[PDB]
Symmetry: C2
Subunit: 320 residues, 2 copies
């Protein structure tokens, strides 16, 4: 379909004139600011404390003072860092939240773009095709409701695994070549890293939904009993909004203690293997080593972020 | 050859705006299942002990 094509131009004009990331990319000083921000958050576990961030930013400013054409300050690093950080918060690029600072989704996308723009390592690896093949293999074998097809698929899979077991019993096994392992490690890192990319879009979904709820209530005459069911209706509405729905299923899976613990153990043994150190620098390996911890804590943070809207029912209903 | 094709630059630029509001999402239980399965595969392959 192509009827929307007329409207898409207006949509893109909107995005250009308002969206944070795009506006950032158009600034005369875009690369310097984006690089500074990238470096700042490149070391984060979670939201960084305001003063830790201030120190790091002031130090980084010192490193780039030689770029004098941009009116970069040359006599006061802490004041400059504070001014710039305040401005960036004004740019809707980072959040005045809980004494810490987090990367707005706009910053996430701008980082992904520019960091994926120059001459670099590509977004893929030689192992991507194998992963896609396995994923399609599972997607088809599970979408197919014909039980006959499913049982036949299992009959052949079990035979393949039986071949493998017999081969190993006879004393023959196979392992990855070094560079093959390098590519697989890079593939793992590329995949798992994307899991973090959308938490703070779900956060914004909750924020916008809650602000829309409170905004529509400007009809002070509204029969307040509606919220007795709207308490469930908001949850249902966001449980079909792909953000909240997918995040809820993600939590449902994230609660499988055995699977997450096993995946962490496997990640540990993978990072231990020598090839790991070659595929990734120490920073990336440290990031991946505790990844499960990061996901757990970020999900819990987003939960306690939606928490604000949860109590809003009584704040709306009651008076006295 | 008389035809026209989009350079990689334009491909990436398109991928940028399309990753704005109308973007697709990856923080998914599906993605986690993929990563879990494929990490199992990677570990088992890297294990040399028969």
């Amino acid at each position: 379909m192509e009827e929307n094509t007329r409207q898409r131009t207006e949509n893109y004009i909107s995005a250009k004139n308002q969206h944070p990331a795009w506006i950032l990319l158009a600034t005369r000083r875009a690369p310097l600011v984006l690089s500074a921000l990238k470096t700042l958050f490149e070391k984060s576990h979670d939201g960084i404390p305001l003063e830790e961030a201030i120190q790091s930013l002031s130090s980084i400013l010192i490193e780039h003072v030689s770029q004098e054409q941009y009116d970069i300050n040359q006599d006061n690093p802490f004041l400059q860092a504070s001014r710039e950080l305040r401005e960036w918060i004004k740019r809707r690029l980072i959040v005045e939240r809980d004494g810490r600072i987090f990367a707005t989704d706009a910053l996430e996308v701008a980082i992904t773009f520019v960091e994926s723009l120059d001459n670099r390592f590509m977004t893929s690896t030689a192992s991507r095709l194998s992963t896609v093949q396995r994923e399609i293999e599972n997607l088809e074998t599970r979408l197919n409701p014909n039980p006959a097809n499913r049982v036949a698929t299992l009959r052949r899979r079990i035979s393949e695994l039986e071949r493998e077991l017999q081969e190993a019993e006879a004393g023959h096994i196979e392992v990855l070549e070094t560079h093959q392992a390098v590519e697989h490690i890079r593939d793992v890192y590329n995949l798992a890293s994307s899991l973090r990319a959308d938490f703070r879009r779900v956060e914004d979904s909750w924020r916008e939904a809650d602000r829309a709820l409170r905004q529509s209530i400007i009809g002070e005459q509204y029969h307040r009993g509606d919220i007795v069911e709207r308490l469930l209706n908001d949850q249902d509405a966001l449980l079909n909004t792909p953000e909240g729905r997918v995040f809820d299923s993600f939590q449902q899976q994230l609660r499988q203690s055995s699977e997450l613990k096993a995946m962490s153990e496997r990640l540990r043994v993978i990072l231990s293997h020598p090839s790991a150190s070659d595929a990734l620098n120490r920073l990336q390996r440290h990031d991946l080593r505790w990844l499960v911890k990061r996901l757990v804590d970020e999900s819990q943070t987003v939960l306690q972020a939606r928490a604000r809207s949860e109590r809003d029912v009584r704040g709306f209903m009651k008076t006295g």
